[PDB]
From a paper:
The [name] transposase possess two helix-turn-helix (HTH) DNA-binding domains, a DDE catalytic motif and a β-barrel followed by a flexible carboxy-terminal region. [name], similar to the MuB and TnsC helper proteins, is a member of the [name]+ family and a close paralogue of the DnaC/I helicase loader. However, this tetramer state is inactive and requires the regulatory [name] factor to perform transposition.
The cryo-EM structure showed that the IS21 holo-transpososome is formed by one [name] tetramer and two [name] decamers. Notably, they do not assemble into a continuous filament but instead interact in a head-to-head configuration (that is, through the interior terminal dimers of each decamer, labelled 1 and 1′ in Fig. 2c). However, the interaction between the two [name] decamers also induces the DNA to adopt a sharp deformation at their junction to give rise to a kinked S-shaped configuration overall. For [name], this recognition occurs through the C-terminal β-barrels of the catalytic transposase subunits that are flexibly tethered to the DDE domains of the enzyme. These elements dock into a deep exterior cleft formed between the N-terminal dimerization and C-terminal [name] domains of [name]. We therefore performed both particle subtraction (to remove the flexible parts of the transposase and the [name]+ oligomers) and focused refinement of the holo-transpososome core; the resultant 3.2 Å reconstruction of [name]-bound [name] revealed that the density in these active sites is most consistent with ADP.
Residue numbers in the entry:
A (entry chain N), B (entry chain M), C (entry chain K): 0 to 246
D (entry chain F): 186 to 246
The structure:
């Protein structure tokens, strides 16, 4: 018959969506007056909606983000320090085209990681590659790669991504070996792709964090040559929410 | 708008052929008021036909076929030795299901290669994986694979194909090393995939061909445990063509 | 200044010939006020002629041509067997397009190798690559290639040329190993490039010449599938010249 | 083969049967030899300190 062959071809073209959407659009058009061009337009619309959903899901699967969140979920009234103008300018991702690195600084609990994650999610939705990793985990990966001889592969897969998000930079102290690994990463990403980083320590403390003043100076120079820093301060949202739950 | 979005959708689906073909079939549907189900059926039919044609061309490209030829361009009258019944049975490709090795024997010029290449072309068209190689080339490939340490990769690429067409087996004498390489290939293809072979020497001569009588006996037993050999004899097609051109 | 810069630019463009050609064409134009287009055409045409002559000389040097001889310096009256029509048809090089092998057979002294060498020189002049070699030397070279492991290199350099002129095929008897080497050479050039051969033995004797009847049959079939044979008979030109010198 | 089921063969070796494939450089041929030989065979696996070494030790002491 016709339906079975239609489904066969749809699956052969990798379009079970086509089998599903053709049913719906065909029913709608038989119950309406849809010119064949418009019927096909609706067909392609459904196909690409489902295809884009699957592509975004696959990209998130490849991505190693901590959790899913959106900028709209971020409230600015509770954090007057942040400015919606600059946040939305970042949301437009014009900084990526300008090769500008984003740095978040301030005491923990404010919610900088939320903004970083939201920017990463928007980049993924728009199609730009985005990868996430913590400073400790990234250092562990680089050290293991050097030990096993797969350093080149890990450097390639960490430099290729359009956006890289280093997190928890400052909580854990770094030995000079980890300092040189981080310097390698930064130098590979000097003026090639933006870096989104979050930290709780001032730039000066990085010297003791990496165990080498000169390496810290070089990394800071390269990072801050083209970057934007948000020095956010306020109240630890975790503690504030705990108090609200108590009351 | 509509048409640009449609084109973007079609190219996202990786089907520019679909993009251009839905235009023709949608115009046809409007010109004759074709049902939506039949319209999609036409779209899918044309797209599948083009996809399958491109896949067949790609498969032929990947296979190292020296030349393309079909049983249609074959003479069954000038060669009484061949029987059209058995040739058509081979064309049915029942040997693949029944795991039968197809072998052709006879002096040079008869055309044993033509039937084998036609069967390989039919197998490729139907979707079966078929690969072609000469005994000299196969021995060279095995020796180089052993030398370079990628013996496993070349053994895999020679064994995985559903049909392996070994050609020019007998014109070139083989040493015991090449004998053991060929023995490895045969053992890997013992009862896993049919083998198509062409030769001009009797089975007894294989002992001198491989430089080791016991290896020849073992290979002959392995190959002929499940085999069907066409011993063709008669006038050489090359000589007949030369005579016809002369007259 | 001007002249030194002109010479430097001509040498940088690798056109010292063009440097001397303008040294003459400029004077010629000054004597007749030639148009700039015609002046440049003179320069370019002279440069092209000189470069083509040098390239032809280099091609002659690279090819193992024992001596240069042209069909013009060849009298057909002393050899009634040769028909000027067929000789000039060969000179047209139509066989190259048709991939027809040319064979010259007959008793020594007639001058078959003269025609072979003339065709080789014509091929060099017209751009068709030609390589002239003796059967003994070819066999020795193939054996050396097999011994040293560069068999692929020697087969490549002996198959790439558009024309291969095998000479002295029949004077020296060949062992079966040399027979297989010659068979490899023929097979690589089965339907890829014309072959020009000169011999003094009938096709039947080739079985004893190569020490293998089946190999002889296969090689003869491959050689004569697309070929034009010239079995010349008559008095030896060397003997006639000796008689003329005596008288 | 010539002395198989026709006359006994007395052979002394120091390698297991499997190693004969490497010893002769032909696994199939070595396996054939072993199969034909073992069809009528008696095996003697001798284990002990080398009598040459023990005699040398006794001479030393
Ligand atoms: N505007 C906001 N709206 C809702 N929740 C918020 C907001 N800002 C911060 N939070 C809360 O803060 C926590 C997120 O902390 P986040 O990791 O983003 O910040 P941080 O200061 O980098 O953290 P860390 O303590 O790990 O160093 C979550 O509990 C989130 O609910
Ligand atoms: N019956 C036939 N009808 C049409 N073409 C044929 C027939 N037999 C052979 N040919 C063609 O004649 C040419 C010579 O045949 P082919 O080389 O395949 O035969 P062969 O005996 O396997 O050759 P060889 O042993 O010399 O390599 C090839 O183009 C083959 O396709
Ligand atoms: N028609 C001719 N006009 C002028 N010179 C000729 C003619 N025929 C032959 N010669 C010359 O006679 C000599 C013999 O020619 P060539 O060696 O090519 O003959 P051949 O029959 O192929 O020889 P062989 O079988 O002895 O190797 C060469 O110098 C050739 O130039
Ligand atoms: Mg954080
Ligand atoms: Mg063949
Ligand atoms: Mg000669």
């Amino acid at each position: 018959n016709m339906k079975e062959r239609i489904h066969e071809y749809c699956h052969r073209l990798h379009l079970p969506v086509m089998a599903e959407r053709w049913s719906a659009m065909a029913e709608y058009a038989s119950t309406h007056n849809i010119s064949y061009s418009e019927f096909l337009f609706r067909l392609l619309e459904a196909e690409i909606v489902e295809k884009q959903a699957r592509s975004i899901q696959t990209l998130i699967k490849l991505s190693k983000l901590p959790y899913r969140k959106t900028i709209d979920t971020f409230d600015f009234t509770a954090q007057p320090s942040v400015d919606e103008r600059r946040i939305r300018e970042l949301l437009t991702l014009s900084f990526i085209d300008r090769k500008e690195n984003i740095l978040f600084l301030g005491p923990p609990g404010i919610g900088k990681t939320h903004l970083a994650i939201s920017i990463g999610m928007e980049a993924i939705a728009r199609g730009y590659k985005t990868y996430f990793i913590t400073a400790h985990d990234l250092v562990n990966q680089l050290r293991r790669a050097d030990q096993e001889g797969k350093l080149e592969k890990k450097l390639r897969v960490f430099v290729k991504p359009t956006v890289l998000i280093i997190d928890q930079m400052g909580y854990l102290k770094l030995d000079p070996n980890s300092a040189h690994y981080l310097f390698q990463v930064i130098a590979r990403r000097y003026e090639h792709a933006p870096i989104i980083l979050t930290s709780n320590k001032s730039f000066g403390e990085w010297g003791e964090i990496v165990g080498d003043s000169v390496l810290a100076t070089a990394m800071l120079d390269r990072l801050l040559h083209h970057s934007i820093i948000f020095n956010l301060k306020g109240e630890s949202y975790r503690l504030r929410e705990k108090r609200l739950q108590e009351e």
